[PDB]
Design a protein around this motif. Sequence first.
Motif, PDB file in Angstrom:
ATOM      1  N   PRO A 185      39.798  43.683  42.149  1.00  8.38           N
ATOM      2  CA  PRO A 185      41.181  43.314  42.478  1.00  8.38           C
ATOM      3  C   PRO A 185      41.294  41.893  43.021  1.00  8.38           C
ATOM      4  CG  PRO A 185      40.303  44.736  44.185  1.00  8.38           C
ATOM      5  CD  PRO A 185      39.176  44.462  43.235  1.00  8.38           C
ATOM      6  N   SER A 186      40.159  41.228  43.218  1.00  5.98           N
ATOM      7  CA  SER A 186      40.150  39.892  43.806  1.00  5.98           C
ATOM      8  C   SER A 186      40.615  38.807  42.843  1.00  5.98           C
ATOM      9  CB  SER A 186      38.742  39.553  44.301  1.00  5.98           C
ATOM     10  OG  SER A 186      38.717  38.288  44.938  1.00  5.98           O
ATOM     11  N   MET A 187      41.676  38.111  43.246  1.00  4.84           N
ATOM     12  CA  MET A 187      42.278  37.048  42.450  1.00  4.84           C
ATOM     13  C   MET A 187      41.315  35.893  42.182  1.00  4.84           C
ATOM     14  SD  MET A 187      45.418  37.042  45.063  1.00  4.84           S
ATOM     15  CE  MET A 187      44.088  36.341  46.038  1.00  4.84           C
ATOM     16  N   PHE A 188      40.551  35.512  43.196  1.00  5.24           N
ATOM     17  CA  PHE A 188      39.599  34.418  43.059  1.00  5.24           C
ATOM     18  C   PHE A 188      38.523  34.789  42.015  1.00  5.24           C
ATOM     19  CE2 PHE A 188      40.976  35.087  47.571  1.00  5.24           C
ATOM     20  CZ  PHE A 188      41.961  34.116  47.598  1.00  5.24           C
ATOM     21  N   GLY A 189      38.162  36.066  42.024  1.00  2.54           N
ATOM     22  CA  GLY A 189      37.180  36.580  41.093  1.00  2.54           C
ATOM     23  C   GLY A 189      37.744  36.462  39.697  1.00  2.54           C
ATOM     24  N   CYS A 222      28.388  29.865  44.152  1.00  3.89           N
ATOM     25  CA  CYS A 222      29.325  30.661  44.940  1.00  3.89           C
ATOM     26  C   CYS A 222      30.698  30.005  45.069  1.00  3.89           C
ATOM     27  CB  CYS A 222      28.735  30.955  46.314  1.00  3.89           C
ATOM     28  SG  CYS A 222      26.962  31.306  46.258  1.00  3.89           S
ATOM     29  N   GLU A 223      31.697  30.831  45.390  1.00  2.00           N
ATOM     30  CA  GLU A 223      33.101  30.434  45.588  1.00  2.00           C
ATOM     31  C   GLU A 223      33.784  30.369  44.224  1.00  2.00           C
ATOM     32  OE1 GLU A 223      32.324  26.956  47.756  1.00  2.00           O
ATOM     33  OE2 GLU A 223      32.345  27.925  49.727  1.00  2.00           O
ATOM     34  N   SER A 224      35.056  30.752  44.174  1.00  2.00           N
ATOM     35  CA  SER A 224      35.801  30.813  42.916  1.00  2.00           C
ATOM     36  C   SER A 224      36.145  29.497  42.218  1.00  2.00           C
ATOM     37  CB  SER A 224      37.104  31.568  43.157  1.00  2.00           C
ATOM     38  OG  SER A 224      37.910  30.874  44.094  1.00  2.00           O
ATOM     39  N   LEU A 225      36.764  28.571  42.942  1.00  2.00           N
ATOM     40  CA  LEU A 225      37.092  27.265  42.368  1.00  2.00           C
ATOM     41  C   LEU A 225      35.835  26.460  42.093  1.00  2.00           C
ATOM     42  CD1 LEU A 225      40.430  26.025  43.886  1.00  2.00           C
ATOM     43  CD2 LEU A 225      39.857  26.937  41.623  1.00  2.00           C
ATOM     44  N   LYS A 250      28.168  35.961  51.924  1.00  2.00           N
ATOM     45  CA  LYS A 250      28.076  37.279  51.281  1.00  2.00           C
ATOM     46  C   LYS A 250      29.360  37.579  50.514  1.00  2.00           C
ATOM     47  CE  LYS A 250      26.035  38.636  55.689  1.00  2.00           C
ATOM     48  NZ  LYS A 250      26.505  39.324  56.925  1.00  2.00           N
ATOM     49  N   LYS A 251      30.084  36.514  50.190  1.00  4.36           N
ATOM     50  CA  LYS A 251      31.343  36.577  49.459  1.00  4.36           C
ATOM     51  C   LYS A 251      31.218  36.383  47.954  1.00  4.36           C
ATOM     52  CE  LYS A 251      33.696  34.904  53.548  1.00  4.36           C
ATOM     53  NZ  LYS A 251      34.252  36.204  54.016  1.00  4.36           N
ATOM     54  N   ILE A 252      32.336  36.604  47.275  1.00  7.28           N
ATOM     55  CA  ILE A 252      32.414  36.529  45.825  1.00  7.28           C
ATOM     56  C   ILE A 252      33.603  35.676  45.369  1.00  7.28           C
ATOM     57  CG2 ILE A 252      31.257  38.719  45.569  1.00  7.28           C
ATOM     58  CD1 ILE A 252      34.951  38.741  45.157  1.00  7.28           C
ATOM     59  N   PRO A 253      33.561  35.163  44.123  1.00  9.05           N
ATOM     60  CA  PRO A 253      32.506  35.365  43.121  1.00  9.05           C
ATOM     61  C   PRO A 253      31.258  34.517  43.263  1.00  9.05           C
ATOM     62  CG  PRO A 253      34.143  33.918  42.236  1.00  9.05           C
ATOM     63  CD  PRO A 253      34.665  34.352  43.582  1.00  9.05           C
ATOM     64  N   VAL A 254      30.199  34.965  42.595  1.00  3.83           N
ATOM     65  CA  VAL A 254      28.956  34.203  42.533  1.00  3.83           C
ATOM     66  C   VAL A 254      28.475  34.245  41.083  1.00  3.83           C
ATOM     67  CG1 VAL A 254      26.608  33.896  43.384  1.00  3.83           C
ATOM     68  CG2 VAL A 254      28.299  34.819  44.895  1.00  3.83           C
ATOM     69  N   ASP A 295      29.823  46.419  45.865  1.00  2.00           N
ATOM     70  CA  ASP A 295      30.417  47.267  46.867  1.00  2.00           C
ATOM     71  C   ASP A 295      30.122  46.527  48.150  1.00  2.00           C
ATOM     72  OD1 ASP A 295      31.878  49.885  46.798  1.00  2.00           O
ATOM     73  OD2 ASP A 295      30.481  50.357  48.421  1.00  2.00           O
ATOM     74  N   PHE A 296      31.140  45.914  48.736  1.00  2.00           N
ATOM     75  CA  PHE A 296      30.947  45.128  49.950  1.00  2.00           C
ATOM     76  C   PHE A 296      30.530  46.064  51.076  1.00  2.00           C
ATOM     77  CE2 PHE A 296      35.531  45.800  51.069  1.00  2.00           C
ATOM     78  CZ  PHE A 296      35.975  46.174  49.819  1.00  2.00           C
ATOM     79  N   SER A 297      30.612  47.357  50.785  1.00  2.00           N
ATOM     80  CA  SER A 297      30.110  48.381  51.667  1.00  2.00           C
ATOM     81  C   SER A 297      28.589  48.442  51.496  1.00  2.00           C
ATOM     82  CB  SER A 297      30.733  49.724  51.298  1.00  2.00           C
ATOM     83  OG  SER A 297      32.129  49.595  51.095  1.00  2.00           O
TER      84      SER A 297
HETATM   85  N1  LIG Z   1      36.376  30.599  49.113  1.00  2.00           N
HETATM   86  C1  LIG Z   1      36.056  32.008  48.876  1.00  2.00           C
HETATM   87  C2  LIG Z   1      36.600  32.883  49.999  1.00  2.00           C
HETATM   88  C3  LIG Z   1      37.257  34.106  49.430  1.00  2.00           C
HETATM   89  C4  LIG Z   1      37.038  35.438  50.046  1.00  2.00           C
HETATM   90  O1  LIG Z   1      36.865  35.654  51.250  1.00  2.00           O
HETATM   91  N2  LIG Z   1      37.055  36.432  49.066  1.00  2.00           N
HETATM   92  C5  LIG Z   1      36.890  37.798  49.316  1.00  2.00           C
HETATM   93  C6  LIG Z   1      36.967  38.436  47.964  1.00  2.00           C
HETATM   94  S1  LIG Z   1      38.702  38.751  47.750  1.00  2.00           S
HETATM   95  C7  LIG Z   1      35.500  38.093  49.782  1.00  2.00           C
HETATM   96  O2  LIG Z   1      34.555  37.702  49.139  1.00  2.00           O
HETATM   97  N3  LIG Z   1      35.380  38.847  50.957  1.00  2.00           N
HETATM   98  C8  LIG Z   1      34.063  39.158  51.441  1.00  2.00           C
HETATM   99  C9  LIG Z   1      34.167  40.417  52.257  1.00  2.00           C
HETATM  100  O3  LIG Z   1      34.848  41.389  51.812  1.00  2.00           O
HETATM  101  O4  LIG Z   1      33.564  40.465  53.347  1.00  2.00           O
HETATM  102  C10 LIG Z   1      36.566  32.443  47.506  1.00  2.00           C
HETATM  103  O5  LIG Z   1      37.556  31.799  47.084  1.00  2.00           O
HETATM  104  O6  LIG Z   1      35.980  33.369  46.927  1.00  2.00           O
END
Ligand SMILES: N[C@@H](CCC(=O)N[C@@H](CS)C(=O)NCC(=O)O)C(=O)O
Lengths: 214, 214, 569
Positions: free
Chosen positions: A9-13, A62-65, A49-53, A33-35
């Motif tokens: 559901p992540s827009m950046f993804g 790492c990071e979307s842009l 530990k964020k996405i996308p990668v 699963d961020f779980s």
């Molecule tokens: N600059 C990063 C930051 C975005 C961010 O925090 N994204 C969420 C995904 S919607 C994430 O990875 N959260 C990590 C978590 O759930 O702890 C990006 O654009 O991906």
Amino acid sequence: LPILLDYWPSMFGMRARVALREKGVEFEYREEDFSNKSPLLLQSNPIHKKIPVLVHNGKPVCESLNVVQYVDEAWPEKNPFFPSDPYGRAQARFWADFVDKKFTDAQFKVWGKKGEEQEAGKKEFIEAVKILESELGDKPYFGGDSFGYVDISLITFSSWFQAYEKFGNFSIESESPKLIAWAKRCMEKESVSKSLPDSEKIVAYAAEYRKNNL
Amino acid sequence: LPILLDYWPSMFGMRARVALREKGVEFEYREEDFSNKSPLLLQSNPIHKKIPVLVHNGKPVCESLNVVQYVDEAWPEKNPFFPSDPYGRAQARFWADFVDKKFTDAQFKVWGKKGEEQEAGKKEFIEAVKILESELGDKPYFGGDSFGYVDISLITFSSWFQAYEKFGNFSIESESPKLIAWAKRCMEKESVSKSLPDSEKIVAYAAEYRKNNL
Amino acid sequence: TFDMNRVIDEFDEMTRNAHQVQKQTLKEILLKNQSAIYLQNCGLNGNATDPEEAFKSMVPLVTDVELEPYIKRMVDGDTSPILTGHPVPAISLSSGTSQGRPKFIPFTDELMENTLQLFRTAFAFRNRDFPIDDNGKALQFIFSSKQYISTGGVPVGTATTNVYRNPNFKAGMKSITSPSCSPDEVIFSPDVHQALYCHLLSGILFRDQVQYVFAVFAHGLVHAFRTFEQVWEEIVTDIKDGVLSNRITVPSVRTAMSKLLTPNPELAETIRTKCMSLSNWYGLIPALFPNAKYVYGIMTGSMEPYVPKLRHYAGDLPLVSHDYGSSEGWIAANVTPRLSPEEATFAVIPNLGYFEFLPVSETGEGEEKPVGLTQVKIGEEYEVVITNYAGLYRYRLGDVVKVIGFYNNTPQLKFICRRNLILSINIDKNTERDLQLSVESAAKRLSEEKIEVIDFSSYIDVSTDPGHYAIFWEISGETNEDVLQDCCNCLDRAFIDAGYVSSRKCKTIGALELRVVAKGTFRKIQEHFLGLGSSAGQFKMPRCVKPSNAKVLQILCENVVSSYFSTAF
Ligand SMILES: N[C@@H](CCC(=O)N[C@@H](CS)C(=O)NCC(=O)O)C(=O)O
Ligand SMILES: Nc1ncnc2c1ncn2[C@@H]1O[C@H](COP(=O)(O)OP(=O)(O)OP(=O)(O)O)[C@@H](O)[C@H]1O
Ligand SMILES: N[C@@H](CCC(=O)N[C@@H](CS)C(=O)NCC(=O)O)C(=O)O
Ligand SMILES: CC/C=C\C[C@H]1C(=O)CC[C@@H]1CC(=O)O
Ligand SMILES: CC(C)[C@H](N)C(=O)O
């Protein structure tokens, strides 16, 4: 094949997915699963530990842009995301940051929050859509003669336009038919016709988030 | 003649000045009274109203990181900040994003706030300088084999190190020395050796900020 | 006992006995020293009847490199005697270099005797020309706050400290100088930059009785006053409330100053009024001490460019040039101090050593053998060669001087020299470019404070396991430690070659030590060297110290305004 660590559901993804599909790169999609994050997410990004990668060449991005610019830079042969000039890409980066911050902040206040901050966030969102609408003057896309860079950056929020229309109780089409319709034009493209999950799913998801946290 | 709208203690304005001087441009600096943001600035960014702002061809270029890559693309013949590969560029931008988030806010906490906020900000900057120290690893710089993009981006924070050391009443070098160390290494470049104001004054500014908000 | 007519008369008789005093000086030096191992190889036993002829025909001339192992032998745990004789109470280093590396010279009480006497005679002659009040005082930006101990447990020392911390300095100099304003402890405070701030303060403290402004050099006087231009308002602040600037942290000097302070608001009005009245600070010295008869210092040769900045500071005050000599040997004394510096010449004092001169009269250079002191030629330039109690026997210092005239039977010498220069390849490097670059890289972290680094030096300590490097720095003000520790890291990081990397990362060469020194250390090195007996070519200060350089070395330890072991690594 390049490995994308992403969240459905992540827009950046969605942004990352959009760049690869717009280009023609073939890849394998991965749901985390961020779980219970996979060792690949932990080993690629030991900090955030964020996405996308994206793992390409045995090298993580790492990071979307950052990923989008990585995709344009990795594949500068067919569909170019940025204009040739320094200044055009310059404006593009300025705009990508704008959508990335204030637009994202205002929208987040629209779907994830309640009360006064939601109203404030609403006013901020409508003015932000106003500024987007004005910057384009009335431009079909955003990053080049074809589908562009911040077109990619903003389009993923079009999957959430429904979520904002419902939670924020506003019509971004009655007030800005041009931006929503900018999105619905971009919707004819497979990069948007196959990467942005159904708006119904997102709507139920953001609401479900609203269920989990108070 | 490139016209820069700059602020004497702006780490960001410093990012711009360091970037341009690093490249090899002769340019003009204008100090801003943010109480009276100037007519060209109010036209450069009528909403953010923020600096640094380099003006070229009568076209305002905004945001510090944006401005430094503007620096790269504006004179692409002599001093490049990125390496040849797309991934290297992605790494440098990645780390640029790194300097811009938790690092900036954490310092902002150490010299701008006190007590409960302060300790959190303190463990935050020590953690940041640590990951930082790890990624510096061994390289003279950051963004390439020579003076880089990010070099410009985080070096400018090293005149505020004094302010952090004092209000924090810390010593960020015994926990992570190779960093400030690399910093006074980076001071030997004429780009920053003439763009950056004195630290006692910067400390004093932090002191003024503190005296105003207790 | 210091008196005027008797000493000058004895001096005149002595200078007319120049040849005799000189030869006898040779005899006393060798009767003192028939035993030197350097001499055994030359064939000496003494006495006889062709002694001077024997020494001149049998003893070969020598350089710093050759003398290096022997005095070195004396210093490092082999507390043993060699070139002169006895293990000496202190040791020196010499400007210019010994193949880029360090040179040692012995110190003995005789040099102190030479010290009191040259000062005694010269003071009598100048007091003759610039008569003082016997109840006043003087501005001496003199320092000797540092003392190091050689790795052998032996003291190695600069001219100054050895003089000032000598058991005979106070009682001996009590009669031939106007009493010092600073407490000796301030003179010997572990912080001479703060102490210099204090010296400026102390001299300024008794101005009405102050009879002269003193620094060995124009460089020192100039540094003091440009500094005053910076800090006068601060000086007003410190002196006024009876509380000194928080800038001063060392407790001994701070305690002394506290013994010296109570709140006094009126006088501030005065100082601010006068200090704002001047034109670009021209003529400050007569302003501070309105009755000083003179500015005293070495004003010739390489000091000539700083005489004007100083002249500007000194205004119309007469400028009197100081005499010529050093721990490596005393050469000349100005006995007509009223002469201006451009025309100033200093006459030689004959029992301080036995001297010979090599003429440059052929071309450049020329194969002429040394001729006697009173056999030297008028208006021509020769190089001074020294034989004395300083481990120097027919030693080539490498400096050229010109005889302007004669005072009775003793010669008048002139110095238009600057550097005893040709260089050679070093080992206390780390290319001179690398080291200069090192200080340059680290120092701008200081530049963040509007402070510029005026000078620097280094040292190799191998008594320690693993051995380590010491970097010495002279800066314009007191600052905080965190920036300085950062600096040490930068010096370490400035040694860019792959080798140093291999060592310290491996730890087999210990963490570099930045022992930061105070103002006037390098001023002290310069001040000693130009005055050093030979000819003004004495200013290429050696940059880093192998355990064979001592002038900088004594001025190494006690004023560790701070000294640290790298927290990095
Ligand atoms: N600059 C990063 C930051 C975005 C961010 O925090 N994204 C969420 C995904 S919607 C994430 O990875 N959260 C990590 C978590 O759930 O702890 C990006 O654009 O991906
Ligand atoms: N030019 C000079 N300035 C100060 N003191 C001198 C000078 N020449 C000789 N001396 C005297 O030498 C004796 C002390 O200086 P000293 O000889 O100790 O140092 P050293 O170990 O020989 O070597 P150095 O001074 O060159 O470091 C003192 O009496 C000192 O006055
Ligand atoms: N990321 C921005 C940060 C800029 C920023 O926050 N600038 C502040 C200076 S602290 C500013 O201009 N504030 C406007 C004001 O406070 O008047 C940049 O790099 O320029
Ligand atoms: C006999 C002089 C003893 C010390 C002399 C020092 C002074 O205090 C004036 C400089 C002089 C150094 C010099 O002339 O060699
Ligand atoms: C007496 C003194 C200041 C000496 N000329 C020195 O600097 O070592």
